[PDB]
From Swiss-Prot, chains A, B:
GO BP of this protein: anthranilate metabolic process; L-tryptophan catabolic process; NAD biosynthetic process; quinolinate biosynthetic process
Protein name (record): 3-hydroxyanthranilate 3,4-dioxygenase
NCBIfam families xrefs: anthran_nbaC, PRK13264.1
Species this protein is from: Cupriavidus metallidurans (strain ATCC 43123 / DSM 2839 / NBRC 102507 / CH34) (Ralstonia metallidurans)
Gene transcribed to yield this protein: nbaC
Pathway(s) where this gene product acts: Cofactor biosynthesis; NAD(+) biosynthesis; quinolinate from L-kynurenine: step 3/3
Catalysed conversion reaction: 3-hydroxyanthranilate + O2 = (2Z,4Z)-2-amino-3-carboxymuconate 6-semialdehyde
Length: 170, 170
């Protein structure tokens, strides 16, 4: 049993509540597994969209959240009300908004193999064009993402929309 | 959204309770997805052991169950008490026992790629030797498993232990 014995999930979540809020936001349950199993808390809003080459499973255990999506070339929104489950197909662009403190969402993903890249994207509030995209070989979510977001926020040119000139707020 | 919108999980389980009991036992949530997401009810006991080449995720939503394992060359048991989660590493032999009516376990697995086979095994109650093993390219759990189990139960030679001569009960 390389990942240990069964354990009570509500108590695990209770015990890690202080990581389930800014600034950490989320905590991985088991390390170095093929299934990446995370609990995500809140509050947290964000402007980036995720392009995951594989499926994502959501089970909104506590509180309510929602996903900003690009569904059919249009800005759409999928609500994760408390008790909801959801399977997200590969490559659907999604931007999770988690407004509530104390919320908890079970999120299950797959380790990406070598050369299968994730994308992180920003779109213009005024004209809906892609403003900036970066692709990454994601090895640890908490380690390799913050500097990416930061370099976007720090660069006016990276936030400048190539279509209408509006500088994304970051 | 090829797999539909988010939906309430407790209500889904309630609605499918009549499939969550003999003879069906279990119901897949979404079809033709990479993540195979199933809810398993009860009662059900069984004698076969599963050799899954990939990881298995368990979240025991309702009631209690347990897994007979072969952990370190010894018969062992992992309890799934109500509220427990658990990640099973690849190739750990497991035989789920689900004694309680009305229980519900969320089980998440991966679609096996071509040429990655599952194994189903029986061991002798008297000497612990492998009695019989079959490997299968598992494409649909409910379709390709019952005839396998049945052909084991129907054959005295298949149930005859090659080490001590005892005929497995089936
Ligand atoms: N969808 C998420 C979320 C989320 O939904 O907020 C947090 C962390 C990770 Cl790794 C995700 O894939
Ligand atoms: N572990 C299981 C179970 C179980 O735990 O009873 C039922 C169906 C499937 Cl497809 C599984 O992988
Ligand atoms: Fe994601
Ligand atoms: Fe623009
Ligand atoms: Fe299994
Ligand atoms: Fe034997």
């Amino acid at each position: 049993l390389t990942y240990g014995a069964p354990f009570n999930f509500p108590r695990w979540i209770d015990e890690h509540a202080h990581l389930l809020k800014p600034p950490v936001g989320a905590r991985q349950v088991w390390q170095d597994s093929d299934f990446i199993v995370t609990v995500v808390g809140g509050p947290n809003h964000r402007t980036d969209y995720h392009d995951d080459p594989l499926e994502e499973f959501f089970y909104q255990l506590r509180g309510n959240a929602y996903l900003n999506l690009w569904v059919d070339g249009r800005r759409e929104r999928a609500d994760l009300k408390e008790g909801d489950i959801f399977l997200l197909p590969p490559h659907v662009r999604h931007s999770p908004q988690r407004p509530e403190a104390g919320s908890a969402c079970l999120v299950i993903e797959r380790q990406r193999p070598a050369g299968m890249l994730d994308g992180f994207e920003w779109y213009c509030d005024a004209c809906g064009h892609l403003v900036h995209r970066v692709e990454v070989q994601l090895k640890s979510i908490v380690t390799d993402l913050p500097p990416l977001f930061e370099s976007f926020y720090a660069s006016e040119d990276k936030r400048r929309c190539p279509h209408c000139g509006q500088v994304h707020p970051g």
